[PDB]
Structure 1
Amino acid sequence: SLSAAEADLAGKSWAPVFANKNANGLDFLVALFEKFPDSANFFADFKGKSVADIKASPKLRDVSSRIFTRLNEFVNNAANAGKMSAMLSQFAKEHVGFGVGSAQFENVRSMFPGFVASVAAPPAGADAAWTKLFGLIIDALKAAGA
């Protein structure tokens, strides 16, 4: 987990992002797909489609909301090693099953701090907090076997 300090920093930068869950959520997905085109292929719903097709998809919202909803929960429990344990476990378990491995999470981690700053300048130490958080997730994935 994250320390109570680091978790607070993450939550602080996330608030402005989550404030507009629908819009920001859809934008995070689009930003990912734009920077890491291979990622789209993992989604049954978006395999083959272009970012334009995806933006116009009536399914986008369902996908980006389920991601932001889950993410919020991760931010909310980040400083609790206990909740993180089960959360990471279940998350990893679900994703590996769909063919997603840590490499796809290394990508998310890469672009995430940039995505948040596009909504509002994070406090100092917030970016390190996120990379740590995503580091926890990448580890879980490798343990799950991907």
Structure 2
Amino acid sequence: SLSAAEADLAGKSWAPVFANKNANGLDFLVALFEKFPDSANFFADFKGKSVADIKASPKLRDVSSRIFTRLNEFVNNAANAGKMSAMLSQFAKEHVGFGVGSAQFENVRSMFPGFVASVAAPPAGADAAWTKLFGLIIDALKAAGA
């Protein structure tokens, strides 16, 4: 887990992002797709589609919302190694079954701090907390067989 201090920093940087969950969450998805085009092929709904197609799909909102809803719960529980264990196991089990692996989560980690900053400048120490939070997911995915 993160320490209470780091988790506080991550929550602080996430606040302004989550404040506009519909829009920011669709934006996160599109950024992902722009930067790491192969990601899209993991989704049944967007396999083969171009970013333009993705942005115009009526399915986008459901996908971004579920990521944001779940990410929010990770942020909230990040300092409780207890809940983190449970959350990460499930999260990884779910993903691996869909063919998604840690490399795709390395990609998310790479671009996340840049994405948060696109909304509001994060406090000192926040980027590192996010990178350690995503490092934990990456590790759970490796544990799950990918």
What is the TM-score when the length of structure 2 is the normalising length?
1.00
Q: Displacement, 1:83?
A: 0.2
Structure 1 unpaired stretches of 5+ = none
State how far apart, in whole Å, the 1-side matches of 2:43 and 2:125 are. 33
CA offsets 1:58-91 (integer angstroms, 9 cap, x no match): 0000000000000000000000000000000000
Query: Number of residue pairs matched?
Result: 146
State how far apart, in whole Å, the 2-side matches of 1:43 and 1:77 are. 27
- 1:97 equivalenced with 2:93 (yes/no): no
CA offsets 1:34-54 (integer angstroms, 9 cap, x no match): 000000000000000000000
1:50 aligned residue: 50
Q: Displacement, 1:101?
A: 0.2
User: SS of the counterpart of 2:11?
Assistant: helix
User: SS of the counterpart of 2:58?
Assistant: coil
Q: Displacement, 1:104?
A: 0.1
State how far apart, in whole Å, the 2-side matches of 1:97 and 1:86 are. 17
State how far apart, in whole Å, the 2-side matches of 1:40 and 1:101 are. 13
Structure 2 unpaired stretches of 5+ = none
CA offsets 1:86-116 (integer angstroms, 9 cap, x no match): 0000000000000000000000000000000
Q: Displacement, 1:7?
A: 0.1
1:29 aligned residue: 29
2:111 aligned residue: 111
State how far apart, in whole Å, the 1-side matches of 2:81 and 2:35 are. 31
Q: Which runs of 4+ in 1 moved over 4 A?
A: none
Q: Percent identity?
A: 100
